[PDB]
Amino acid sequence: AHLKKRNRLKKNEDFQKVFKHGTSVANRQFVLYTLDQPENDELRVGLSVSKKIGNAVMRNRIKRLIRQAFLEEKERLKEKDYIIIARKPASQLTYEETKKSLQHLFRKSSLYK
Ligand SMILES: [Zn+2]
Ligand SMILES: [Zn+2]
Q1: Which residues form a coiled coil?
Q2: Most buried one in 16, 20, 27, 44, CB count within 10 A?
């Protein structure tokens, strides 16, 4: 039901690494940063939510949808490091809508085995 701990990019150092050296694709809804770790056997997801969405509830909600959207995809996705920045126009998406969006970027940055 939930994304495993090991599949989560926790601390800032890891993020900065992806930002500075990773690759990027952007949507009207999200900015997906994917670094690359050949030394990682499983993928990692980091979440950055605009914060220009104030309601912790809208932010926590959107995070869950992306995390859960990833769970549905953990198998078809390369084992890299991902950072998804949720843009303002993502705040009101439904799971289905979020998943279609993430797969736009995933198909863009060819992160599909
Ligand atoms: Zn550098
Ligand atoms: Zn590394």
Answers
A1: none
A2: 44
Q: What is the whole-number distance in angstroms between the Cα of residue 19 and the centre of ligand 1? A: 9
Fold of 1-113: Ribosomal Protein S5; domain 2 (3.30.230)
* Domain residue ranges in the chain: 1-113
Q: Which of 71, 86, 112 is nearest to 29 (CA)?
A: 86
φ/ψ of residue 96, rounded to 5: -50, -45
40 in Cβ contact with 18 (< 8 Å): no
Query: How far, in Å, is the centroid of ligand 1 from the Cα of 96?
Result: 36
* Reported structure resolution in angstroms: 2.6
Q: Determine the residue type at 59.
A: R
8 Å CB contact between 34 and 69: no
